């Protein structure tokens, strides 16, 4: 049994005890996913604040901060934005497969 505990690190110094406002810290990520994830998280009707931020160009880090209104924590809203980004990549893959099979 071996998970990976460096890839995502919730920063408790800026995380509300309510859970509805947290600041995550990914390693080895940048504008690639952090702008794709910020887009899909902001489509949740319960999200009040979302933004990604790279602290310095040197280290490969990524901070995204979700604040919700209520009845959904930011950890609960981080993972809805990861499934809908997983579901969106399957739509694009299912359309780009048809059109290659349409030539």
């Amino acid at each position: 049994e071996e998970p990976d505990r460096e890839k995502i690190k919730l920063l408790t110094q800026a995380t509300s005890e309510d859970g509805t406002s947290a600041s995550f810290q990914i390693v080895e990520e940048d504008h690639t996913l952090g702008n794709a994830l910020r887009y899909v998280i902001m489509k949740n009707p319960d999200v009040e604040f979302c933004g990604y931020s790279i602290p310095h160009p040197s280290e490969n880090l990524l901070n995204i901060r979700i604040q919700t209104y209520g009845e959904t924590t930011a950890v609960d809203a981080l993972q809805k934005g990861l499934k809908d980004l997983m579901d969106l990549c399957d739509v694009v893959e299912s359309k780009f497969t048809e059109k290659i099979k349409s030539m």
Binding site: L11, A14, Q25, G51, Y52, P55, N63, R65
Partner: protein, 147 residues
């Protein structure tokens, strides 16, 4: 330096934050130089409208509560200046927001009347974008420059 009688004196006496005004005339010697000057003339301009997802990004692009930039442990924002056709924020309202978060919550906002370097006739007829106006910590008029 190598002892706590010198760490305390590089943090309280010879640090850069106390060296803001020079002792020759009391003029400030620290500030933004070339391309930050020429971005505030675009950001605090009157064409600058930001949507909601763009508004939340520029605040957290500069202010990060994990590093300790906020004083409220949670980013507070403002209502937009345009409601009905589409909700939009103006570029002067981002400068209001970043002053709303870095200043302590107990003290009231800054009240300032000043001038720019940019004359009013470069903007057009009846423009007042030379008189800078802060009223309770809110940029209400005029762009920001080297001045």
């Amino acid at each position: 330096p190598q002892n706590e009688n010198a760490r305390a004196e590089a943090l309280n006496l010879a640090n850069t934050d106390s060296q803001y005004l020079t002792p020759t005339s009391g003029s400030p010697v620290r500030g933004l130089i070339q391309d930050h000057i020429s971005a505030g003339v675009w950001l605090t301009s009157k064409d600058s409208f930001f949507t909601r997802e763009q508004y939340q990004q520029y605040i957290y692009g500069c202010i990060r509560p994990e590093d300790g930039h906020t004083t409220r442990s949670k980013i507070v924002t403002l209502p937009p200046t345009i409601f009905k056709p589409y909700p939009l924020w103006t570029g002067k309202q981002i400068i209001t927001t970043v002053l709303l978060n870095v200043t302590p919550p107990d003290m009231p906002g800054i009240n300032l009347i000043s001038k720019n370097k940019i004359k009013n006739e470069y903007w057009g007829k009846g423009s007042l974008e030379n008189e800078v106006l802060f009223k309770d910590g809110a940029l209400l008029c005029g762009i920001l420059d080297k001045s």
